[model samples]
Target: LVHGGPCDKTSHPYQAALYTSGHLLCGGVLIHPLWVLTAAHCKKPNLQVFLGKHNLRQRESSQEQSSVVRAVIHPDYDAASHDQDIMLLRLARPAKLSELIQPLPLERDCSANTTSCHILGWGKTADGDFPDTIQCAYIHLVSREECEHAYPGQITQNMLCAGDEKYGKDSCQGDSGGPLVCGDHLRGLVSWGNIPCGSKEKPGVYTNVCRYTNWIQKTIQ
Candidate 1:
């Protein structure tokens, strides 16, 4: 969410807020009526998900709240290097879909033509303060060669990097659980990145969600 701005609520209805003990835990993606995708590191028990939300302090009529009954972390999830840092939650019941609350299409192969991408959340902005409304940042993909040159062997097959070289278009702290939408596809998930974040050559690290499509299908089928 660093260096991002507020966006229209209806424009990205697939985003959902995961709360634990009344605190916003992380942001996730509504990929299906009964399924949500997020970072495994942010998983918690008894999570309540709120969808179609904009203002964090105010609830919109379009918002739909649902409890998480099960959270399944990737079997290969690695915390040391954060490889495969992805999770899936089965909602207690199917989400009551609406114009302002719906599921987004998931695509594993986000191809080379993919340049336009985005990450949305209510996480900290440039001022190191959480946004009252959802923030959106239009980010671009960084080549693996360039990303590896910066990260140095940390970028695995299950991970990808995206961000800017000299600005705050990167995903900062408190924003690790949102989806990485590249060209209308649920392509990645915010995972890890530079401490000073958005610094030169240190692009935002993300879990390459495309790597998990097969597992997700089997888990939820």
Candidate 2:
């Protein structure tokens, strides 16, 4: 059996891989030295996290970087609008950083301009399907005005929008809980996307991390 590896991590730097049932792959983010932010949908009573490694197929160098999850903090998480579909995980131990391995902070605000943030996850490179491995892409954050234009009466201030109408890239099925990072800090969490992954003019929607600053701070501390 595969003991440890980045089975769900992408070849890119901004995404993380998570495991469940030795199969169901989920995406996550390193938001702190000992905390990872992910989707409430990826919920498992027991979870594990690994860092300092990228290649999941052969991870001889990452055996020691894995840790058991201590707790999952997800408030108001439910089926409807996936209530606050955000979760925070605590590592059994703290992460040891390297040049390419470091945590991204959850930004409270970069003004509305934080919409320029980008997204990464283990979803399809072009659609909302999971690839054989993880994928990476850049998504320009959309301002509330634009989001309203895209999903009128649906986009809320608590939400953040990413993805471009010109490009086919978007966050989909396997991108949940993964971070939408901007300026090296986290501004959004992958929540929902236009059904069928990449749809023209229908940008993906995410949970604005800035809206959950209080809960995030208390749990991470």
Candidate 3:
């Protein structure tokens, strides 16, 4: 999770924010001791991973470790859609697992199933709400057909959808490339959720982990 203010310019300005610049997007699930999966389009060239972190603001009890990114695997990822957003970052060394931090397995085939998934991030809660703390939520998985019907032109096969249409629970701005986890496996990467936080008509779009299993294996192993 991010350690500073979400989008607060006085805290982390976008103009000056860059990898290792302290405006860290530092959030990901360690698919391997030395490999982390995240979004590709993110400011990664100078990025670092802060493991064993629970509180993004406070450093106490949080292990402040720095990791170097060896490679980036963005999924059909580009500036426009960022929909195909997925990346695998290799750490300089393996992270020692603790009660607060652990590497999650890659669930290659479970993203499409109608199972509940957990998404965590250090992004804005609403359109204007800066990420005050690390936030997580349980959202139901929605199939491509349903997502396409809802989003119409934007949603694609490479994308995964999750969230309830009624309760208005989903990821929002500043929460891209976050983890979409389920059953102890990394299923999806937070791409873009419905605009305005949770729109009843638009479901959030995530990168389908199932579709990129082959790429992930080849890139990391």
Count of residue pairs whose backbone atoms collide, per candidate: 0, 2, 1
Report the lDDT tens digits of candidate 1 across residue range 15-97: 98889898887888999999988899987778888888989898688888898889999998989999889999999999988
Cα lDDT tens digits for candidate 3, 188-208: 777776666773567777888
The 10 consecutive residues of candidate 1 with the worst lDDT sum are 165-174
User: What would the per-residue lDDT of candidate 2 be over residues 27-66, giving only the tens digit for each residue?
Assistant: 7887777777888787776565656545455554543344
Error of 3 at 66 (Å): 1.6
Q: Candidate 2: deviation at residue 62, Å?
A: 4.1
Worst 10 residues of 3 by lDDT: 9-18
Q: Each prediction's Cα lDDT score?
A: 0.83, 0.66, 0.64
RMSD of each: 1.3, 5.1, 6.3
Q: Could you tell me which 10 consecutive residues in candidate 2 have the lowest summed lDDT?
A: 1-10
- Clash count, predicted structure 1: 0
Between 1 and 2, whose lDDT is larger?
A: 1
Quote each prediction's TM-score: 0.95, 0.82, 0.83
